[PDB]
């Protein structure tokens, strides 16, 4: 239910180091005989892709502040180059987490 993509059943990795953490003097945290960092790729971040899709489209259709980038050596075209390239990250995240299923019609049904 902590959902991993049907095409990645092996999607995990470990290291275990013998050196414990430590916390600067006056810092915020406890002392702990064991600690863990995690790095996990998930489609859930796509909501930020799509949030940069809303914040670019809103303000760039108005071409607000565009002349500050242009005046310092960019062109409007490369501010579209970027948008569209980011779109290919965004539409990819809109498709990668699907199931490795192939074929057409529904999955089950009836016959005479």
């Amino acid at each position: 239910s902590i959902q991993f993509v049907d095409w990645c059943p092996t999607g995990f990795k470990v290291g275990i180091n013998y050196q414990p953490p430590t916390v600067v003097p006056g810092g915020d945290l406890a002392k702990v005989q064991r600690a863990v960092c995690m790095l996990s790729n998930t489609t859930a971040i796509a909501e930020a892709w799509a949030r940069l899709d809303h914040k670019f489209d809103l303000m760039y259709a108005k071409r607000a502040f565009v002349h500050w980038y242009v005046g310092e050596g960019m062109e409007e075209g490369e501010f579209s180059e970027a948008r569209e390239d980011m779109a290919a990250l965004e539409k990819d995240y809109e498709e990668v987490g699907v199931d490795s299923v192939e074929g057409e019609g529904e999955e089950e049904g009836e016959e005479y």
Binding site: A61, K62, E84, A88, V96
Partner: protein, 49 residues
């Protein structure tokens, strides 16, 4: 006298996307080779003349 100016027009280009290819790996391969052929290995020739 006609008093001066009083007319601007908006700095506005609508936004759209073109030639954004759906290049996801979701169907990225099709190639196959069989797991070997069928053979018989369990039987003797019994070739006693």
């Amino acid at each position: 006298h006609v008093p001066g100016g009083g007319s601007v027009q908006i700095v506005y280009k609508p936004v759209d996307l073109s030639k954004v290819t759906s290049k996801c790996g979701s169907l990225g391969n099709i190639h196959h080779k069989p797991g070997g052929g069928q053979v018989e290995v369990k039987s003797e020739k019994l070739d006693f003349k």
